Amino acid sequence: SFFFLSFHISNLQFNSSLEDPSTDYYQELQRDISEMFLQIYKQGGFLGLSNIKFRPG
Amino acid sequence: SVVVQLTLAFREGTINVHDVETQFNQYKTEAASRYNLTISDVSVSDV
């Protein structure tokens, strides 16, 4: 099943690069988050990250 | 800061939205300690 997850980060600021997945910062950021998430959900229920979208906060 | 909205996929009959909030909120500090990331708040909906 799929769930909708939303959150805000202060460690990073909104960047034009993040306003477009055409940048490595955006792609890596997803990965870093995906990597970090895998640590939180190690329970195994985790499957992967999909349909990511970023926005200014 | 940045507001991110995505879709998180979990196995069915394994983890509930309630459990997700529990680990994520509990991991906000530790997951943050490991990656040095800062989170303001998290929200998970099944709809």
> Which positions in chain B touch A16 (Cβ < 8 Å)?
none
Chain B, residues 11-30, CB within 8 A of chain A, namely 11-12, 14-15, 17, 19-20, 23-24, 27
CA distances from B10 to A21, A26, A38, A55 (A): 24, 23, 11, 24
Determination technique used: NMR
Number of structural domains chain B divides into = 1
Domain containing B14 equals 1-47
Q: How far apart are CA B8 and CA A49, in angstroms?
A: 6
Q: Determine phi and psi for A44, rounding to 5 degrees.
A: 110, -25
Q: Torsion angle of alpha carbons B26, B2, A32, B13, nearest 10°?
A: 50
**For position B30, which CATH number holds?**
6.10.140.600
Alpha helix (H) residue ranges in A1-57:
24-40
